[PDB]
């Protein structure tokens, strides 16, 4: 089948969490990983990762810098939220001046010329959805237009498949990608993400846009 | 100092959670508590506590119902969000026919009124800006307009004091207040945000709005 997006980025925030008892409510950003998927090569073409600088709060616990594998020395080294997106809005540049590519609010045929279009991809609504948008809201930083549209990977793989995965690494496993050890984190689950976006690809899957705001 | 309102509506919902990593799972409101402050002698005149039955994730996690202390048969007891907003503003109604309560930021005639004005207050942006927010455009809801603007106790807890609260319960420790016990969910919760406004409204600060969204 031929594909409606030529490229395809992926993300997967990792963010602060507690298990302790307390009663938290805001999430902040520690990393913002970015993989740009060729979805006609299945190649990745470039990549983006920085690390948040939590400002509300400064100290992650242990069981945060357990389950994203951040230590506390890469947040200290990493800049503010408000930074970051200025940085990746300038790599969101950087790929436009080398693949020619834009975002489409509504997007019905595939490009046939020299243009490529593109589309976010995230395991969930999560990311774009609520984390980015809570604390961009909370902040009250500017966030970039683009983001407000996204492929929720799950939904595409539930019904694509039609079965319910058991989570990003139940979906790899099911569909023959066999991988072992700890749950990866920050841009290695967005590397694994693609392979999965990719695999789907070959099987047949038509990416489509499932979220607007 | 004196007051812009006369009564305070204090909330804290509880919704269902889970602490897994990057399992993200959407989240349903399963109480909806409410408290109504009387800015002047203190008390609480009237409190208001649904339990709301989810119905994306119907059954509580081991740890949602650690941490909130709510059981599966209150939520099974309980009502739908739908029904449980409709409940709400029949208390909202209740207690204007009682209290002659108007939601209103200012009047502008001269003090020929014996009207009371009214307020919600939250510790955090969280309850109204996000959590009734999001879960009513996501099962397309309609939200009562007078939920779009709020008191955030917590900015205003910030300023007053100039110091940088860990929570609620820190909030009312560094003030005095020491509750015994787990750590108060839903209408508790709410009653003990009460007792914190009615502490900063003694020592002199006058409860403004913050945060508006219509
Ligand atoms: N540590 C936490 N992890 C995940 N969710 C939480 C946590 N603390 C509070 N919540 C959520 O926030 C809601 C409100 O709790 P409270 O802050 O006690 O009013 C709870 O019902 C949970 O859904
Ligand atoms: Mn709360």
Redesign the interface.
Known sequence: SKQLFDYLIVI?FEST?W?D???H??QEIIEFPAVLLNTSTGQIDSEFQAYVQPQEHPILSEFCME?TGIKQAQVDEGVPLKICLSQFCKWIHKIQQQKNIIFATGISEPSASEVKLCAFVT??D?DLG?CLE?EC??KQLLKPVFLNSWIDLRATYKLFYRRKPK??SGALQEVGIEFSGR?A?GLD?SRNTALLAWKMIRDGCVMKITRSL
């Open positions: 997967d969490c298990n008892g307390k009663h409510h805001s389950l395991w969930s999560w609520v809570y809201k909370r989570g990003l749950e984190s689950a």
